[PDB]
């Protein structure tokens, strides 16, 4: 016997207290060690309802990440409001680490174990845990990186598909590696991402087929973002302390979704490194130091896609999707979907 409730959580990790990397440093003083012997209890005959779009766990993880970035990344100048803030900006060690979210005494986290779970509705197979699985706080747009994969089928997550203001979350069942590199030694900000087109387009085709199932077999078409800052019009993410901006036009090639040459092979996305960025915290802009010397390389697993559907009329022929992102709560929802906090009464 229990009921839904909200409570102040606490985090756990396997961060080392000696590491100079920012995620480890923060997790050392803000979190507790990971439970050596975690407990999980299955609940037979229990059909509990979940709702990933109204889960206070999401709001609390966001607050942690806000806190993490605020005291980790030190920009040279901070363009917030009318005032400008000049300060020291040393380059830092940056690599996200898994974080477990746990309930205090008196509460417990219900976990849905349905393979075909789209974030909402009931769950025939429910278990109970003290802490969630290790979740890396990877802040990125358009493409979800280093996350978890869906079992069995690809999952399209949305509160209301008719609500075109809402961001759609595609949950892949097969990871696709993206290879971003800033070569050493002559634009020091020029970069590029390598992606296996044969693997990617094969996946992307399956995504459209899944989108067809949600839209009366209509024609699925991808288009570049209609507008916005470079952080969302391009695939943006942080690699080794440097902010990358990659063009995803080639990642949504409708031609490649419909046995041709040029779609098979290594796709190369042109990327840029910007010192002046827009803060996702909504604070404003922040200028950083020029990129470090040497080879800057990141290899990530694309585990999900953020999409935004178009509105209007005069269609009936096709549905148009554009690469979404911007509100990082979506990122956490893509991982905190199978969890919810309940109070044992």
């Amino acid at each position, epitope marked *: 016997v229990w009921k839904d409730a909200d409570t102040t959580l606490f985090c756990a990790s396997d961060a080392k207290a000696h590491e100079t990397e920012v995620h480890n440093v923060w997790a050392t003083h803000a979190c507790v060690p990971t439970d050596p012997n975690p407990q999980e209890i299955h609940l037979e005959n229990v059909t509990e309802n979940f709702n990933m779009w109204k889960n206070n766990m999401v709001e609390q993880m966001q607050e942690d990440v806000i806190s993490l970035w605020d005291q980790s990344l030190q920009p040279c100048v901070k363009l917030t409001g009318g005032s400008v803030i000049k300060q020291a900006c040393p380059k830092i060690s940056f690599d996200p680490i898994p974080i477990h979210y746990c309930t205090p005494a008196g509460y417990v986290i219900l976990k849905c174990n349905d393979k075909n779970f789209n974030g909402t509705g009931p769950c025939k197979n429910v278990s109970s845990v003290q802490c969630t699985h290790g979740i890396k706080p990877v802040v990125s747009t358009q493409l979800l990186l280093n996350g978890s994969l869906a079992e069995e089928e690809i999952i399209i997550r949305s509160e209301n598909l008719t609500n*075109n203001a809402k961001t759609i979350i595609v949950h892949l069942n097969k990871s696709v590696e993206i290879n971003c590199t800033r070569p050493s030694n002559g634009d020091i900000r020029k970069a590029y991402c390598e992606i296996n087109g044969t693997k990617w387009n094969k996946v992307l085709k399956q995504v459209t087929e899944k989108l067809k199932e949600h839209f009366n077999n209509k024609t699925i078409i991808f288009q570049p973002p209609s507008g916005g800052d470079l952080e969302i019009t391009m695939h943006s993410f942080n690699c080794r302390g440097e902010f990358f901006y990659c063009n995803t036009t080639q990642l949504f090639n409708n031609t490649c979704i419909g046995t041709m040459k040029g779609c098979n092979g290594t796709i190369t996305l042109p990327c840029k490194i910007k010192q002046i960025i827009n803060m996702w915290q909504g604070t404003g802009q922040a200028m950083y130091a020029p990129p470090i010397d040497g080879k800057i390389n990141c290899v990530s697993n694309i585990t999900g896609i953020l999409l*935004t559907r178009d509105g209007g009329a005069n269609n009936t022929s096709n549905e148009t999707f554009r690469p979404g992102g911007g509100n990082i709560k979506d990122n956490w929802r893509s991982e905190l979907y199978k969890y919810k906090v309940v109070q044992i009464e």
Partner: antibody
Amino acid sequence: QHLVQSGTQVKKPGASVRVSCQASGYTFTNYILHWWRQAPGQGLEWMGLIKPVFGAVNYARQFQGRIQLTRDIYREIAFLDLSGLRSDDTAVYYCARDESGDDLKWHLHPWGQGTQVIVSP
Amino acid sequence: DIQMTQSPSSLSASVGDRVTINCQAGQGIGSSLNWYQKKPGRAPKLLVHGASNLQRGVPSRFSGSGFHTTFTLTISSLQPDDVATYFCAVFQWFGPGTKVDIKR
């Protein structure tokens, strides 16, 4: 909790127009703005939405290639740019705030007082 | 599109009387329906959101109810400043509207 829009403007057919929307009372970066217009003897039609954080937008299918929604996160003011003006574009243009916030439930409050745009030779 | 229908098209009632405005849906909506008051020369005014929740500032004489397809806005005591067209709306989809004046 106020949204003040720019004064009424008159444009020749084929020109362009920019309409501003000055937010006042609330935390500007916390809520989504929608844009609407109502022609005389017509119902309200949605033109697009804008998300103040990164300037993310969602234009109505019939205005794409003409409409540009922008904002100033510091001045806390939204803008609407419509080019290739026609006679049927003569309407009262509104900007409204989604008071629901992050969960995007289209709870529209408050609204702008409405900017009249007249397209005539 | 989401099909929106309001009945009746226009409505008359004396001051202090009860008025119910109906709104139909072409498909399931749940509670995602809002109500707006529209006067000429004035911006739309949110009265009821989430089907039944009253917007802050709006007098309690206004009442919302409904689910799935059927929805109803009720005015317990009609006042002369309630003379306006009333719209039920789902996201960007607005109903045809319902004019309401004071009966004499």
